[PDB]
């Protein structure tokens, strides 16, 4: 219902969206464009990394999980710098920067 109506943005529907990708997909189907019970890409993209930074998404020591969160929200610079710090994934982060360049 609230995937069709883009409502109840605060309720993460955790009963059915238990994975991270299920959350991203749940919200990107809820973002809106031009006051209550409404979320926009700017709020969502900022809300995610500002409040729930790397710390929240890298506790499982899985780096790509956070990268996908930033890249699939149009925050390409964040995801590039972030992934560029993983000494094992420097190569990959430089190139995804070149492509964007």
């Amino acid at each position: 219902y609230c995937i069709i109506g883009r409502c109840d943005v605060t309720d993460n529907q955790s009963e059915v969206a238990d994975k991270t990708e299920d959350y991203l997909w749940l919200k990107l189907n809820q973002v809106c464009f031009d006051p209550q019970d409404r979320l926009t890409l700017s709020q969502f993209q900022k809300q995610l990394l500002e409040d729930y930074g790397e710390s929240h998404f890298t506790v499982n020591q899985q780096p790509f999980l956070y990268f996908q969160v930033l890249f699939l929200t149009a925050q390409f610079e964040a995801a590039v710098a972030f992934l560029f710090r993983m000494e094992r994934l420097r190569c990959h982060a430089v190139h995804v920067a070149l492509v964007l360049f």
Binding site: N12, S14, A17, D18, K19, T20, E21, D22, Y23, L48, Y52, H56, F57, V59, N60, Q62, F64, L65
Partner: peptide
Amino acid sequence: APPVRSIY
């Protein structure tokens, strides 16, 4: 309260 469990 988003989960941190990656789709595996």
